[PDB]
Amino acid sequence: GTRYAGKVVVVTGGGRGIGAGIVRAFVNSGARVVICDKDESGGRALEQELPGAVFILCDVTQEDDVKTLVSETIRRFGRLDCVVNNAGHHPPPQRPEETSAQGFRQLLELNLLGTYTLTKLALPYLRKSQGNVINISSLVGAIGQAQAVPYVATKGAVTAMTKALALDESPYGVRVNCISPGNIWTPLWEELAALMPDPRATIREGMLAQPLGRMGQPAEVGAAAVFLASEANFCTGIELLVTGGAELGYGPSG
Amino acid sequence: GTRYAGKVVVVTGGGRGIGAGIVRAFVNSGARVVICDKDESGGRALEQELPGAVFILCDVTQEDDVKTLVSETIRRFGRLDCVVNNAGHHPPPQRPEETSAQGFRQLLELNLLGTYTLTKLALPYLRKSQGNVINISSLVGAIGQAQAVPYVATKGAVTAMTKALALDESPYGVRVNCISPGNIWTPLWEELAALMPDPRATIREGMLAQPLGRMGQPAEVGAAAVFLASEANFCTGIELLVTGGAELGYGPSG
Amino acid sequence: GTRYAGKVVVVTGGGRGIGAGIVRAFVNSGARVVICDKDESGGRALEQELPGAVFILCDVTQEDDVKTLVSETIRRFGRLDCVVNNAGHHPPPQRPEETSAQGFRQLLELNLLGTYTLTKLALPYLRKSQGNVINISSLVGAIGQAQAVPYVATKGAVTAMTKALALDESPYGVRVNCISPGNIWTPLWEELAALMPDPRATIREGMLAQPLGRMGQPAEVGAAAVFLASEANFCTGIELLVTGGAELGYGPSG
Amino acid sequence: GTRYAGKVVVVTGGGRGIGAGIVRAFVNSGARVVICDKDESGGRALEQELPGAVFILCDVTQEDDVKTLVSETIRRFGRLDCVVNNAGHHPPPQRPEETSAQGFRQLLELNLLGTYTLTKLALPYLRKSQGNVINISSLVGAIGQAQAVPYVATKGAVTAMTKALALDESPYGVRVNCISPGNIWTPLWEELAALMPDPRATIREGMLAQPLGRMGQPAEVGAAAVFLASEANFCTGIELLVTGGAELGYGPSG
Ligand SMILES: NC(=O)c1ccc[n+]([C@@H]2O[C@H](COP(=O)([O-])OP(=O)(O)OC[C@H]3O[C@@H](n4cnc5c(N)ncnc54)[C@H](O)[C@@H]3O)[C@@H](O)[C@H]2O)c1
Ligand SMILES: NC(=O)c1ccc[n+]([C@@H]2O[C@H](COP(=O)([O-])OP(=O)(O)OC[C@H]3O[C@@H](n4cnc5c(N)ncnc54)[C@H](O)[C@@H]3O)[C@@H](O)[C@H]2O)c1
Ligand SMILES: NC(=O)c1ccc[n+]([C@@H]2O[C@H](COP(=O)([O-])OP(=O)(O)OC[C@H]3O[C@@H](n4cnc5c(N)ncnc54)[C@H](O)[C@@H]3O)[C@@H](O)[C@H]2O)c1
Ligand SMILES: NC(=O)c1ccc[n+]([C@@H]2O[C@H](COP(=O)([O-])OP(=O)(O)OC[C@H]3O[C@@H](n4cnc5c(N)ncnc54)[C@H](O)[C@@H]3O)[C@@H](O)[C@H]2O)c1
Ligand SMILES: O=C(c1cccc(-c2cccc(O)c2F)n1)c1ccc(F)c(O)c1O
Ligand SMILES: O=C(c1cccc(-c2cccc(O)c2F)n1)c1ccc(F)c(O)c1O
Ligand SMILES: O=C(c1cccc(-c2cccc(O)c2F)n1)c1ccc(F)c(O)c1O
Ligand SMILES: O=C(c1cccc(-c2cccc(O)c2F)n1)c1ccc(F)c(O)c1O
Ligand SMILES: OC[C@H]1O[C@@H](O)[C@H](O)[C@@H](O)[C@@H]1O
Ligand SMILES: OC[C@H]1O[C@@H](O)[C@H](O)[C@@H](O)[C@@H]1O
Ligand SMILES: OC[C@H]1O[C@@H](O)[C@H](O)[C@@H](O)[C@@H]1O
Ligand SMILES: OC[C@H]1O[C@@H](O)[C@H](O)[C@@H](O)[C@@H]1O
Ligand code: NA
Ligand code: NA
Ligand code: NA
Ligand code: NA
């Protein structure tokens, strides 16, 4: 691929799931990719698998990890063109009264502030390259979800922050966009389902939540990311839905 | 007024600005109102001014303050029908690189987690009354704003959280809605403008940002809140825009 | 009621259903109301029932009917403060290939162009009164609906037109807003359900389509309309959802 | 290019402007393209210019033209994979009172019903190919525009219809999406500007309406269309904004 040849991309949480699909999509486009993850297992194997991808251990909640991530990317590859802020977590379903302020703070640290910190540290280099930022938010930031008040709040924050930053960075030619996936079949989805009374029914429900009748694939989120980075030069501040139509349509007066 | 007679309302940050307008609108509707504020000056005078309103000193970032707020409301008035989460702050304009993770955390503590904490502590009583929650978010959570990445992020979070909570509380008959004001003429607006090079021009700009050619009034946000509490029984999870049309419309190819 | 005392309101399709609930809500607010309908049965009885409401036979697809509607309102009441464009129809479920361009044109004539024609003829008088326009659109204009391509298209048109007109009329102090109801229990809903294989199941489905677990009432749409007319002086171009939360939330990868 | 190799695409209004950019983007992707236009000049030259593109004279408001368009595409190329409904018109700025029902009907015939008619006639073949529909709507369908009530209404209709059709066609594996461009520099934009008092100032205004400080290019809309057709397999019913950020942000209380 040559769509994004000569470009350098950082993907956080790139060791499995959506992040690994984004990594593969950018390598297939011709980019060199830095896989950031807090766990070694997936990302290290991915680094061996993909020429053009390398792994850097980095917990995005730790500012000194992220500092080193950016400085190592520049030291090893000489430029930085795109940051994909994919690292994030969905906790198990939790009723509002079962949440805590402290759990909510910790989820904000990962899903919101880690995106903020890498974006901030990368922006000097993105300005030099007229690069771009892609945040991985969620459909449920826009429409809500049951038993997930903290998660929904963090993704509403990411989507809004994307628009604010797009405004601030547009004078410098740096675009900032997000992708809001719906149900994507990943190890997180599989882990959440395994906690449920009937996991198999939970998965069947997840498939049928989309008009297309299936869940999405990491590769489909990856193609959207490559589009935003490489071919969407007049897109900034957009929310690209990759949801299979879940937000469409519906799903005595007393 | 009798639209909300016999009802008990808590308004956070009710001592001035939008919150004071909401307090007045609910008193005028027949409700008893608890004015929560971290500063005594405005709220204490408002308590003397309005029969049916009382003042409780309470910093919504301090969980034990909020606990006492709820327990004192119930001890003094016997019920709780509506919580208006209005307390919040807009920092001065800040370029992204001039923000800090720590400032962002502190703003999340006020604009997002204080709303969360009062809502959580109030929900047992709102369930008993089939009451409702009204969060004061912002238009810029939805469309973005320049030089305000942390603020925009917090309001995107509030709007999303409103939808998530509406889903969770609908089985219990508790509605959860938000109001997204645009430019409202308040002491915060006046303070921000006074920091600018030309404050008078900043204010003229703010007026003309709306098709209606003026800024909004606290009383107009108050009327929207009374509508949501007292007459919107089939509304839950909505974002009620009180913006004068700022989001409408627009404001060689190389 | 005195919220809209001394004001004159026209409600199209006011003879039953949502329109009749809007008529009642405005009479209860103190307004004088002109009930426009193409059928006499409901509107005539409503005129006898409600002091302050009168009935004018008028098919909103017939420009000379609408001309006479406006001129008779002014001749009999001396002013015009608010037009509620409620007349509209939802055809039975139709697969896309079972629709016709001609059916689509006819539905546009009612749901879109009749709203346009009355608004146009009323605007000279609304300018004199600094009055306002309320269009009754639909949630499915925003999120879509199955087997309803023409209907969804007409309501997407109404919602967009509302925003365009708000922009054009804001310099004249005339606000233009819409209400997007979800499932409201009306004679139209009952008629559509009666065409289905199991009407009772269709109705049960409609109730459970909302997190609140019931359909809405005409009176709830009416209260929203009175709010927009009488108390939303800083709202223009908004889409007020009266849906019970139907748009919230959701309802292996191959 | 091989992204859309072996595929057959129809682009309406493909003879100039956005449509010509879409035609070029699909040819560059490896597709064979049928250029539909009501005028011969541009499309005929484009057919001579591009191997893999051919021109068919067709007025999308004339059902027998569109019938022949589809039957000639199938007769000459054996399949149909994607329909891009780009033909449309923006009239000169018109105050609401300067519009007519008849002008509005004529604009609906082009911008809305021509899209409907080609989509309907193409869907049997798109089902066989698991193809897709791309409608070219407009940002102003979503946020409004001054002096353009009919145009805004038609584009609100197109965007809503896109979602309705996505729902209906998802069981058949046919995706239906739209693109909502903002200011794109085209012959239509140039013609509208030339009618203004100061055309040069109108163009400068149009450039600065976007945070990116320029208008968009047909090629950028084309890349978005190729993305939707060839790589967005989990996207249906979406509205892809290609606006340069015009919808972001903003642009005493009496
Ligand atoms: N799977 C879905 O249906 C879905 C839907 C919408 C949005 N999303 C979002 O997509 C993103 C990825 O989701 P997923 O399903 O692939 O999840 P996942 O759990 O399968 O993978 C997440 C990856 O991020 C890594 N990670 C977690 N915390 C990290 C940290 N502090 N620093 C660095 N890396 C860290 C994990 O180790 C893992 O490799 C998340 O932001 C999630 O909110 C997921
Ligand atoms: N003014 C606008 O244009 C505007 C626009 C959109 C949204 N808003 C939102 O409306 C709300 C009120 O804004 P405003 O303009 O009236 O502001 P303001 O500064 O005039 O008033 C805010 C009030 O909240 C109180 N408060 C602050 N921190 C508190 C805390 N920790 N605990 C309790 N009370 C606290 C303040 O003491 C003050 O009385 C905020 O949430 C703001 O984000 C304002
Ligand atoms: N019922 C719902 O769930 C629902 C949901 C969303 C939006 N809506 C909208 O609300 C409006 C009213 O719906 P409803 O359920 O009350 O319908 P309804 O069929 O019960 O009542 C419609 C009324 O309008 C009148 N009318 C129809 N054509 C007319 C014409 N040409 N001129 C004048 N009057 C005419 C009818 O005679 C009738 O009295 C419509 O615009 C509909 O699209 C309805
Ligand atoms: N230019 C912009 O800024 C802009 C912005 C948003 C959306 N759009 C939309 O993009 C589309 C194309 O716009 P443009 O600026 O390229 O316009 P344009 O006028 O430059 O080109 C339109 C093309 O469509 C053809 N056409 C018109 N009527 C037709 C008919 N009945 N049958 C067949 N072909 C017909 C014209 O002959 C022409 O070749 C339109 O739907 C327009 O609403 C344009
Ligand atoms: O990971 C999931 C997922 C995976 C499996 C189950 C769930 C889930 C479903 C309902 C409620 C609830 O509280 C849930 F967490 N959610 C997910 C699902 C959708 C989505 F938009 C996301 O951003 C997600 O992260
Ligand atoms: O308080 C303000 C305000 C008041 C005065 C000026 C500003 C402001 C304007 C532009 C950028 C910027 O960063 C700004 F902070 N904002 C405000 C303005 C709009 C709005 F929607 C809000 O929620 C607000 O809090
Ligand atoms: O009138 C109805 C209604 C009433 C009864 C059934 C239906 C309906 C449901 C599914 C698909 C379908 O094509 C349908 F028409 N719709 C209605 C339902 C929801 C809504 F938002 C509207 O605007 C409506 O008019
Ligand atoms: O073609 C234009 C255009 C090109 C040149 C000027 C204008 C225009 C600007 C303001 C009001 C007004 O009534 C206008 F028509 N509009 C255009 C501009 C933006 C847009 F979203 C569209 O869909 C468009 O078609
Ligand atoms: O675990 C669920 C799925 O996760 C995805 O990220 C992987 O690409 C799949 O191989 C796996 O089936
Ligand atoms: O300070 C700006 C404005 O703040 C509002 O909250 C008050 O109601 C006004 O009296 C004041 O002019
Ligand atoms: O027919 C269904 C319902 O229609 C509503 O408009 C009426 O207010 C109800 O009395 C009736 O039950
Ligand atoms: O006329 C304005 C512009 O129209 C676009 O469609 C063409 O690609 C340009 O060559 C031209 O400058
Ligand atoms: Na490697
Ligand atoms: Na008092
Ligand atoms: Na009467
Ligand atoms: Na050719």
Total domain count for chain A?
1
- Please, what is the Cα angle at A217 between A211 and A221, to 5 degrees? 100
In terms of DSSP H, where are the helices of D78-216?
101-108, 115-129, 140-143, 149-169, 187-194, 199-208
C-alpha Rg value of chain B to the nearest Å: 18
Q: Which two tokens stand for residue A147?
A: 């038993």
User: Please, are residues A206 and D248 in contact by the beta-carbon 8 Å criterion?
Assistant: no
How far apart are the C-alpha atoms of D92 and D145, rounded to whole Å? 12
How far apart are the C-alpha atoms of D135 and B74, rounded to whole Å? 56
CA D102 from centroid of its chain's CA atoms: 23
Q: Among partner residues A95, A117, A147, which is closest to B101 by beta-carbon distance?
A: A117
Nearest CA in chain D to B244: D253
How far apart are the C-alpha atoms of C25 and C220, rounded to whole Å? 9
D246 CB contacts (<8 Å, ≥6 apart)? B250, D139, D182, D183, D209, D210, D211
How far apart are the C-alpha atoms of C164 and C158, rounded to whole Å? 10
- Between the CA of residue D87 and those of A234, D81, D219, what are the distances in Å? 21, 18, 16
User: Please, are residues B14 and B54 in contact by the beta-carbon 8 Å criterion?
Assistant: no
Count the Cβ atoms, other than its own, within 10 Å of residue A71. 11
Nearest CA in chain C to D95: C168
How far apart are the C-alpha atoms of A233 and A132, rounded to whole Å? 10
C-alpha distance from C52 to closest chain D C-alpha (Å)? 31
Domain span holding position B95: 1-254
H or E segment and range at residue D44: helix D40-49
Evaluated on CA atoms B239, B243, B249, B252, the torsion sign reads negative
Q: Residue D23 is which amino acid? A: V
B252 CB contacts (<8 Å, ≥6 apart)? D185, D203, D206, D207, D214, D215
In the numeric block, the tokens 């830095």 are attached to: A34
The CATH number of whichever domain residue A228 belongs to comes to 3.40.50.720
Strand-by-strand arrangement of the D82-85 sheet: D53-57, D32-37, D8-12, D82-85, D132-136, D175-181, D239-242
Nearest to C153 by CA among D95, D124, D117, A19: D117
Phi, psi dihedral angles at A132 (to 5 degrees): -155, 160
- Between the CA of residue C172 and those of B212, B214, C123, what are the distances in Å? 9, 13, 10
H or E segment and range at residue A69: helix A63-77
User: Please, are residues A115 and A161 in contact by the beta-carbon 8 Å criterion?
Assistant: yes
DSSP type of residue D9: E
In the numeric block, the tokens 């998965």 are attached to: A203
Which ligand is closest to the CA of B192, given by its number? 6
DSSP type of residue A6: T
How far apart are the C-alpha atoms of D215 and D96, rounded to whole Å? 27
Q: Determine, for residues D63 and C101 on separate chains, whether the beta-carbon distance falls below 8 Å.
A: yes
Q: For the residues of chain C, what is the DSSP string, one character each?
A: --TTTT-EEEEETTTSHHHHHHHHHHHHHT-EEEEEES-HHHHHHHHHH-TTEEEEE--TTSHHHHHHHHHHHHHHHS---EEEE-----PPP--GGG--HHHHHHHHIIIIIIHHHHHHHHHHHHHHHT-EEEEE--THHHH--TT-HHHHHHHHHHHHHHHHHHHHHGGGT-EEEEEEE-SB-SHHHHHHHHTSSSHHHHHHHHHHTSTTSS-B-HHHHHHHHHHHHHT-TT--S-EEEESTTTTSS-----
User: Please, are residues C222 and C248 in contact by the beta-carbon 8 Å criterion?
Assistant: no
Residues in chain D with CB shorter than 8 Å from the CB of C168 are: 95-96, 146-147, 149
Residues in chain B with CB shorter than 8 Å from the CB of D247 are: 143
User: Please, are residues A19 and A12 in contact by the beta-carbon 8 Å criterion?
Assistant: yes
User: Please, are residues D147 and D105 in contact by the beta-carbon 8 Å criterion?
Assistant: no
Which ligand is closest to the CA of A184, given by its number? 1
How far apart are the C-alpha atoms of D27 and D84, rounded to whole Å? 13
How far apart are the C-alpha atoms of D34 and A150, rounded to whole Å? 50
Active-site entry in A4, A116, A125, A151: A151
Report chain B residues touching chain D, CB-CB < 8 A.
140, 143-146, 182, 184-185, 203, 206-207, 209, 214-217, 246-254
Atom of ligand 5 nearest to the CA of A92: 15
How far apart are the C-alpha atoms of A227 and A250, rounded to whole Å? 30
Identify how the structure was determined: X-ray
| Residue D32: strand, helix, or coil | strand
Q: For the residues of D166-184, what is the DSSP string, one character each?
A: HHHHGGGT-EEEEEEE-SB
Looking only at the bridges linking them, the beta strands covering B132-136 and D132-136 are unpaired
D247 CB contacts (<8 Å, ≥6 apart)? A237, B143, D139, D142, D143, D182, D241
| Residue A165: strand, helix, or coil | helix
How far apart are the C-alpha atoms of B113 and A102, rounded to whole Å? 10
**Ligand 4 binding pocket includes D65 (Cβ within 6 Å):** no
Phi, psi dihedral angles at D215 (to 5 degrees): -85, 165
Q: Which two tokens stand for residue A45?
A: 């194997």
How far apart are the C-alpha atoms of B143 and D251, rounded to whole Å? 12
Distance from Cα A110 to the centre of ligand 1, integer Å: 10
User: Please, are residues B93 and B148 in contact by the beta-carbon 8 Å criterion?
Assistant: yes
- Between the CA of residue A136 and those of A28, A55, C31, C187, D235, what are the distances in Å? 20, 20, 51, 45, 16
For the purposes of burial, counting CB atoms within 10 Å of the CB of A72, is it exposed (0-12), middle (13-18) or buried (19 or more)?
middle
Report chain A residues touching chain B, CB-CB < 8 A.
63, 95-97, 99, 101, 104-105, 108, 112-113, 116-117, 119-120, 123, 140-149, 152-161, 163-169, 237
How far apart are the C-alpha atoms of B14 and B73, rounded to whole Å? 15
Report chain A residues touching chain C, CB-CB < 8 A.
140, 143-146, 182, 184-185, 203, 206-207, 209, 214-217, 246-254
How far apart are the C-alpha atoms of A162 and A141, rounded to whole Å? 13
Count the Cβ atoms, other than its own, within 10 Å of residue C91. 15
Chains that touch A (3 or more CB pairs under 8 A): B, C, D
A26 CB contacts (<8 Å, ≥6 apart)? A4, A9, A11, A33, A82, A84, A222, A225, A226, A229
B186 CB contacts (<8 Å, ≥6 apart)? B16, B17, B18, B218
Evaluated on CA atoms C160, C162, C165, C171, the torsion sign reads negative
For the purposes of burial, counting CB atoms within 10 Å of the CB of A198, is it exposed (0-12), middle (13-18) or buried (19 or more)?
exposed
How far apart are the C-alpha atoms of A65 and A58, rounded to whole Å? 5
Strand-by-strand arrangement of the A175-181 sheet: A53-57, A32-37, A8-12, A82-85, A132-136, A175-181, A239-242
In the numeric block, the tokens 């978010």 are attached to: B137
Evaluated on CA atoms C110, C113, C119, C122, the torsion sign reads negative
Closest residue by Cα to atom 18, ligand 6, is: B183
Closest residue by Cα to atom 5, ligand 12, is: D186
Residues in chain C with CB shorter than 8 Å from the CB of A207 are: 252
H or E segment and range at residue A208: helix A199-208
Chains that touch C (3 or more CB pairs under 8 A): A, B, D
How far apart are the C-alpha atoms of C156 and D165, rounded to whole Å? 13
Following CA atoms D71, D74, D75, D76 in sequence, which dihedral angle do they give, to the nearest 10 degrees? 120
**Ligand 6 binding pocket includes B90 (Cβ within 6 Å):** yes
How far apart are the C-alpha atoms of C28 and C31, rounded to whole Å? 7
B17 CB contacts (<8 Å, ≥6 apart)? B184, B186, B187, B188, B218
To the query of whether residue B151 is one of the catalytic residues in this protein, the response is yes
How far apart are the C-alpha atoms of C208 and A251, rounded to whole Å? 8
Nearest to B175 by CA among C21, C213, C223: C213
Residues in chain B with CB shorter than 8 Å from the CB of C233 are: 220
DSSP type of residue D54: E
Atom of ligand 8 nearest to the CA of D139: 21
Q: Which residues of D are identified as catalytic?
A: 151
Distance from Cα A92 to the centre of ligand 5, integer Å: 8
Evaluated on CA atoms B160, B165, B166, B168, the torsion sign reads positive
Closest residue by Cα to atom 5, ligand 11, is: C186
User: Please, are residues C108 and D156 in contact by the beta-carbon 8 Å criterion?
Assistant: no
Q: Residue D39 is which amino acid? A: D
How far apart are the C-alpha atoms of C18 and B214, rounded to whole Å? 33
**Ligand 5 binding pocket includes A185 (Cβ within 6 Å):** no
Closest residue by Cα to atom 14, ligand 5, is: A93
Per-residue three-class SS string for chain B: CCCCCCCEEEEECCCCHHHHHHHHHHHHHCCEEEEEECCHHHHHHHHHHCCCEEEEECCCCCHHHHHHHHHHHHHHHCCCCEEEECCCCCCCCCCHHHCCHHHHHHHHHHHHHHHHHHHHHHHHHHHHHCCEEEEECCCHHHHCCCCCHHHHHHHHHHHHHHHHHHHHHHHHCCEEEEEEECCECCHHHHHHHHCCCCHHHHHHHHHHCCCCCCCECHHHHHHHHHHHHHCCCCCCCCEEEECCCCCCCCCCCC
Longest distance between any two alpha carbons in chain C, whole Å? 66
CA A33 from centroid of its chain's CA atoms: 15
**Ligand 7 binding pocket includes C74 (Cβ within 6 Å):** no
Report chain B residues touching chain C, CB-CB < 8 A.
163, 166-167, 170-171, 173, 175, 211-213, 216-217, 220, 223-224, 227, 231-238, 240-245, 247-249
Residues counted in chain C: 254
C-alpha Rg value of chain A to the nearest Å: 18
- Between the CA of residue C127 and those of A100, C169, C175, what are the distances in Å? 53, 8, 10
Which ligand is closest to the CA of A146, given by its number? 5
User: Please, are residues C77 and C56 in contact by the beta-carbon 8 Å criterion?
Assistant: no
Nearest to D249 by CA among B44, B123, B209: B209
Mutate-to-test residue for ligand 12 from D185, D207, D217, D221, highest number of ligand atoms within 8 A of CB: D185
CA D172 from centroid of its chain's CA atoms: 23
Q: Which two tokens stand for residue B216?
A: 């909004």
Per the DSSP assignment, residues forming a β-bridge with C85 are: C135
Count the Cβ atoms, other than its own, within 10 Å of residue D254. 8
Looking only at the bridges linking them, the beta strands covering D175-181 and D239-242 are parallel
- Please, what is the Cα angle at D223 between D109 and A13, to 5 degrees? 125
Resolution to one decimal, Å: 1.8
Nearest to A15 by CA among A66, A72, A53: A53
How far apart are the C-alpha atoms of C19 and C4, rounded to whole Å? 18
Nearest to B134 by CA among B170, B182, B83: B83
Nearest to C96 by CA among A187, D96, D118, A210: D118
How far apart are the C-alpha atoms of C81 and C144, rounded to whole Å? 32
Chain breaks in chain B (C to N over 2.5 A) after: 251
Evaluated on CA atoms D71, D74, D77, D80, the torsion sign reads positive
C115 CB-side CA count, 13 A: 31
User: Please, are residues D119 and D83 in contact by the beta-carbon 8 Å criterion?
Assistant: yes
Q: Which two tokens stand for residue C237?
A: 């171009």
Q: Among partner residues D143, D203, D209, which is closest to B247 by beta-carbon distance?
A: D143
For the purposes of burial, counting CB atoms within 10 Å of the CB of A57, is it exposed (0-12), middle (13-18) or buried (19 or more)?
middle
Count the Cβ atoms, other than its own, within 10 Å of residue C39. 12
Q: Residue A147 is which amino acid? A: Q
User: Please, are residues B227 and C227 in contact by the beta-carbon 8 Å criterion?
Assistant: yes
How far apart are the C-alpha atoms of B154 and B166, rounded to whole Å? 18
B42 CB-side CA count, 13 A: 19
C-alpha Rg value of chain C to the nearest Å: 18
Count the Cβ atoms, other than its own, within 10 Å of residue C102. 9
Burial D147-159 (b: 16+ CB within 10 A, else e): bbbbbbbbbbbbb
Q: Which two tokens stand for residue D249?
A: 């942000």
How far apart are the C-alpha atoms of C146 and D166, rounded to whole Å? 9
Distance from Cα C183 to the centre of ligand 7, integer Å: 7
Which ligand is closest to the CA of A190, given by its number? 9
How far apart are the C-alpha atoms of B234 and C245, rounded to whole Å? 8
How far apart are the C-alpha atoms of D214 and D185, rounded to whole Å? 9
| Residue D76: strand, helix, or coil | helix
Chain breaks in chain A (C to N over 2.5 A) after: 251
For the purposes of burial, counting CB atoms within 10 Å of the CB of C205, is it exposed (0-12), middle (13-18) or buried (19 or more)?
middle
User: Please, are residues D66 and D117 in contact by the beta-carbon 8 Å criterion?
Assistant: yes
How far apart are the C-alpha atoms of D95 and B174, rounded to whole Å? 45
C-alpha Rg value of chain D to the nearest Å: 18
C38 CB contacts (<8 Å, ≥6 apart)? C13, C57, C58, C59, C60, C87
How far apart are the C-alpha atoms of D147 and B108, rounded to whole Å? 41
Closest residue by Cα to atom 25, ligand 5, is: A90
